[PDB]
Design an enzyme around this catalytic site. Structure first.
Site, PDB file in Angstrom:
ATOM      1  N   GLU A 165      39.648  47.039  30.475  1.00  0.00           N
ATOM      2  CA  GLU A 165      39.264  48.304  31.111  1.00  0.00           C
ATOM      3  C   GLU A 165      37.834  48.804  30.972  1.00  0.00           C
ATOM      4  O   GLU A 165      37.612  49.931  30.533  1.00  0.00           O
ATOM      5  CB  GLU A 165      40.205  49.430  30.654  1.00  0.00           C
ATOM      6  CG  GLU A 165      41.607  49.455  31.299  1.00  0.00           C
ATOM      7  CD  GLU A 165      41.677  50.281  32.596  1.00  0.00           C
ATOM      8  OE1 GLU A 165      40.978  51.318  32.674  1.00  0.00           O
ATOM      9  OE2 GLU A 165      42.445  49.908  33.522  1.00  0.00           O
ATOM     10  N   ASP A 166      36.869  47.985  31.370  1.00  0.00           N
ATOM     11  CA  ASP A 166      35.455  48.371  31.314  1.00  0.00           C
ATOM     12  C   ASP A 166      34.913  48.782  29.953  1.00  0.00           C
ATOM     13  O   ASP A 166      34.308  49.846  29.802  1.00  0.00           O
ATOM     14  CB  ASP A 166      35.169  49.488  32.326  1.00  0.00           C
ATOM     15  CG  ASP A 166      34.661  48.948  33.655  1.00  0.00           C
ATOM     16  OD1 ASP A 166      33.549  48.366  33.676  1.00  0.00           O
ATOM     17  OD2 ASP A 166      35.376  49.097  34.669  1.00  0.00           O
ATOM     18  N   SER A 167      35.133  47.912  28.975  1.00  0.00           N
ATOM     19  CA  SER A 167      34.680  48.091  27.601  1.00  0.00           C
ATOM     20  C   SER A 167      34.659  46.658  27.093  1.00  0.00           C
ATOM     21  O   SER A 167      35.264  45.789  27.709  1.00  0.00           O
ATOM     22  CB  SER A 167      35.680  48.943  26.809  1.00  0.00           C
ATOM     23  OG  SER A 167      36.985  48.390  26.845  1.00  0.00           O
TER      24      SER A 167
END
Ligand SMILES: [Zn+2]
Ligand SMILES: [Zn+2]
Ligand SMILES: [Zn+2]
Lengths: 65, 33, 47, 270, 134
Positions: free
Chosen positions: E3-5
């Protein structure tokens, strides 16, 4: 901003090799890629390290007290 | 022949000491080149 | 020997003084002035 | 002809690499060591800087950080206890090595600070420990930092044990190599291609040392894995061999401490 | 990394990957009041008032400032100042409760009027942590 003592990825010693790299150019008139192959820097992890560091400190030293 | 106010000059413009100054000069004036 | 205190921006050189002792340096009118480190020793972790 | 099992056969060799072919073991085992070497091998480096004076451009902790990376000698290490264990309130010659450093910019032309300039002040107790591992061509090694005219820098460091878990600066490691079944005969991968899997994907130097596929033959589902082409490098602190032997050792120690706790555990009960 | 991390090689962070710096520059002057009523840069305490602060004043040398080397933290004081009102009311300057590090350089200059002008810088090295953004 000085030579990054040792690589980030593998950490293999790299804070000395600096001056020797800068020379394998201005004098030994080689090309980057090879200059680095010469200083033992094989795999890119440690390579990108030198080939990218910008020795700003010089421009720093050039100030005063 | 009278004086009237102060004009907040621009930097690196003609009326700036830096306009002329070079390499050395700047580094000594502290001003980043 | 002898302790120090403040300094000059360009004609940098130990200076010191206190209250109503002007502000300028003993030379460079340049009225700046830093305070220089404490005799106290600092310390850091090697990480 | 001899030796119970896990046998090796060093391929090449050098003062900074032990390209060897370890074979007949559990991959688990192989990796297990691989790790142990990077991670838990006792070393030594600075872990406490004491800035007295500094005019450099690199502010304290910058220098203070790199100092921890400057590889230091550690051949004997195993005879220089961790501060934490020793009874000396803080540190002592039976747990730590003390170094000094002092620079002044006399040469009105960029004066350099090298690892070679460190000064062992505490009793080396007569043991290979605390020496600024140098491989530099000239012998200056590890450029610490630079300075100008009246730029000074007085420090005082304190080396302690430590391992790669606590921090990387204690990594005797460097970077190992690892590979097995160069012809993916166990099919531990499913090569992605656009056309000929064989083409797009380069072959490896470690194929010569193992038999090619040979179509016809079905799929050996009983196929397991021995023979691992490792390449334990090193940074100096420890001789390329020990970073392998000690690796073979530290692991083995722990493995026993498990038995050790299985003994102390039994004795316990009323 | 979902998730975008992402996941960041700790080891590398140690060897100095992505370490940064950080400077802040608290600042202050000596207020005046036509009728030659001026403030001061000292290291005050009791003296009637009670109007002081909470952070260890100690780190304040006598000029009312902190020497560059000092290691500042919680709400310690960076500038000891007072004010005359009709007798030693405070006007000091504590650190940013959240931040903390090492004094980095204090400087004291005059000022168009004449007042004592002081700027204080604090250095801090910020290592990449689990929540940091990239
Ligand atoms: Zn590398
Ligand atoms: Zn001056
Ligand atoms: Zn001890």
């Amino acid at each position: 901003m000085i030579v990054p003592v040792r690589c980030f990825s593998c950490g293999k010693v790299v804070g000395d090799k600096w001056e020797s790299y800068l020379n394998l150019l201005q004098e030994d008139e080689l090309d980057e890629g090879t200059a680095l192959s010469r200083l033992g820097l094989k795999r890119y992890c440690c390579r990108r390290m030198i080939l990218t560091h910008v020795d700003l400190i010089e421009k720093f030293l050039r100030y005063n007290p | 022949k009278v004086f009237i106010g102060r004009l907040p000059i621009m930097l690196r413009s003609k009326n700036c000491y830096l306009s002329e100054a070079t390499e050395s000069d700047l580094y000594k004036l502290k001003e980043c080149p | 020997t002898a302790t120090l205190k403040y300094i000059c921006a360009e004609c940098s050189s130990k200076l010191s003084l206190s209250r109503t002792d002007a502000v300028r340096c003993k030379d460079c009118g340049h009225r700046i002035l830093l305070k220089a480190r404490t005799k106290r020793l600092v310390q850091f972790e090697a990480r | 002809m001899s030796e119970e099992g896990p046998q090796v056969k060093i391929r090449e060799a050098s003062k900074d690499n032990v390209d060897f072919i370890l074979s007949n073991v559990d991959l688990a085992m192989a990796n297990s060591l691989r790790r142990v070497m990077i991670a838990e091998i006792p070393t030594l480096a600075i872990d406490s800087v004491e800035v007295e004076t500094n005019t450099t451009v690199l502010a304290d902790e910058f220098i203070a950080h790199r100092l921890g990376l400057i590889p230091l000698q550690s051949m004997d290490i195993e005879q220089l206890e961790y501060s934490r264990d020793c009874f000396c309130e803080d540190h002592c010659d039976k747990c730590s090595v003390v170094l000094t450093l002092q620079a002044f910019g006399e040469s009105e032309s960029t004066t350099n600070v090298y690892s070679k300039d460190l000064v062992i002040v505490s009793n080396l107790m007569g043991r290979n420990i605390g020496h600024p591992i140098i491989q530099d061509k000239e012998g200056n090694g590890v450029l610490i930092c630079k300075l100008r005219k009246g730029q000074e820098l007085k420090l005082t460091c304190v080396a302690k044990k430590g391992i790669a878990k606590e921090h990387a600066k204690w990594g005797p490691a460097a970077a190992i190599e690892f590979e097995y079944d160069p012809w993916n005969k166990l099919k531990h991968t499913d090569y992605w291609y656009e056309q000929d899997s064989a083409k797009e994907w380069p072959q490896s130097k470690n194929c010569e040392y193992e038999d090619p596929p040979n179509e016809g033959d079905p799929f050996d589902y009983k196929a397991q894995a021995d023979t691992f082409y490792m390449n334990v490098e090193s940074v100096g602190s420890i001789p390329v061999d020990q970073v392998v032997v000690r690796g073979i050792d530290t692991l083995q120690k722990k493995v026993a401490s498990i038995l050790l706790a299985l003994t102390q555990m039994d004795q316990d009960k009323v | 990394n979902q998730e975008d991390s992402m996941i960041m090689n700790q080891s590398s962070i140690d060897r100095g990957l992505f370490r940064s710096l950080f400077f802040r520059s608290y600042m202050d002057q000596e207020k005046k009041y036509g009728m030659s009523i001026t403030e001061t840069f000292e290291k005050p305490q009791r003296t009637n008032t009670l109007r002081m602060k909470h952070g260890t004043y100690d780190k304040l040398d006598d000029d009312g400032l902190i020497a560059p080397g000092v290691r500042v933290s919680g709400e310690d004081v960076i500038i000891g100042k007072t004010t005359p009102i009709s007798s030693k009311r405070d006007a000091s300057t504590p650190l940013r409760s959240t931040e903390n590090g090492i004094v980095d350089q204090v400087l004291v200059t005059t000022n168009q009027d004449g007042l004592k002008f002081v700027k204080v810088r604090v250095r801090t090295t910020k290592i990449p942590q689990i929540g940091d953004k990239f």
